[PDB]
Amino acid sequence: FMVSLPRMVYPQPKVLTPCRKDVLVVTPWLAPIVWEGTFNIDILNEQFRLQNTTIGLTVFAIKKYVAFLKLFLETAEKHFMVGHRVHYYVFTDQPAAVPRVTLGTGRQLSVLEVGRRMEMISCERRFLSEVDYLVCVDVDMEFRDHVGVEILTPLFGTLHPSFYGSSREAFTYERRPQSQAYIPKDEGDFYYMGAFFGGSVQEVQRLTRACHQAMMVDQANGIEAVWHDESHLNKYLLRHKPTKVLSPEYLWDQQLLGWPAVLRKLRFTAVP
């Protein structure tokens, strides 16, 4: 049950004036594509705060990648779901190397030692009991601007920043029919990056369970998909359409791609 929003004063949306005329803001299966200027974050924050939403953020930091955690976590404190409850789950082979990062109120961090990403996430009962949504991201990244509850939905993928302008035949999907991740050249909506996906805990466990079963089949068969778990994530999202898609504002590399006019904010970016 969802209680009433309170009175709020904000600019009226006008039906004969689009927010953004330069980009597609809705997929053909009526999922929003989240770009700056499409959402009123005050309305969204009220909706999700009224449900006491908790967001889990999963990050893997193995071997040398523990060095990315201080910036990743300190910038998440500045820009990720600020005002909402957050639980960070850091999977690592080096628990003593996780940096001591000061968290805002209502935010917690768990260190999970590991001796894999899809298999590790599909931890199942723990996530169901502790968070409402799960967001799964790469560690070698930093938040530069707002990443908030506008992303949240049963299932989301993020447009890969190298391919958002590309035709489908150029997408680097797995093209061998011998792979569970196979997508032919006349299929595909988008090319999604393995570096930032998420959803309700239930939909994320479905996805990661399905990807993990498909990767095991491929192994048994002596085949490894061209972009590994990302190839399987794309096949999953082709056949199970995400209920939101994040624009490349949400996964960018300024060194490689600059700051084009179509991106009004660079929110979550590669660290050189």
Ligand X SMILES: O=c1ccn([C@@H]2O[C@H](COP(=O)(O)OP(=O)(O)O)[C@@H](O)[C@H]2O)c(=O)[nH]1
Ligand Y SMILES: OC[C@H]1O[C@@H](O)[C@H](O)[C@@H](O)[C@H]1O
Taking CB under 6 A as the rule, which mask of x and - marks residues 114-143 in contact with ligand X? ------------------------xxx---
CB of 160 to ligand Y, least distance (A): 6
- Which of Mn ion, ligand Y, ligand X, none has residue 162 at its interface (CB below 5 to 8 Å by kind)? ligand Y
Spatial distance between the Cα atoms of 162 and 196, rounded to a whole number of angstroms: 14
* Position 151 contacts ligand X (CB under 6 A): no
* Closest to 138 measured CA to CA, from 239, 254, 26, 253: 253
61 binds ligand X (CB under 6 A): yes
Smallest Cα–Cα separation from 73: which of 101, 48, 34?
101
Given ligand X, ligand Y, Mn ion, none, residue 139, with its beta carbon under 5 to 8 Å by kind, binds ligand X
Which of residues 98 and 118 has its CB atom nearest to ligand Y in the complex? 118
Identify which of residues 138 and 174 has a Cβ nearer to ligand X in the complex: 138
DSSP conformation letters of 53-112? -EEEEEEEE-GGGGGGHHHHHHHHHHHBSTTSEEEEEEEES-GGGS---PPPTTEEEEEE
Q: Give the separation between CA 25 and CA 203, rounded to whole angstroms.
A: 23
88: tokens are 């960070």
Q: Report the distance separating Cα 204 and Cα 199, nearest Å.
A: 6
Instruction: Tell me if 160 is assigned to a ligand binding site.
Output: yes
Q: Could you list the residues known to form a binding site for UDP-N-acetyl-alpha-D-galactosamine, using ranges.
A: 60-62, 65, 138-140
Q: Which residues bind ligand X (CB under 6 A)?
A: 60-63, 65, 138-140, 195
Q: Could you list the residues known to form a binding site, using ranges.
A: 60-62, 65, 138-140, 160, 172, 230, 253
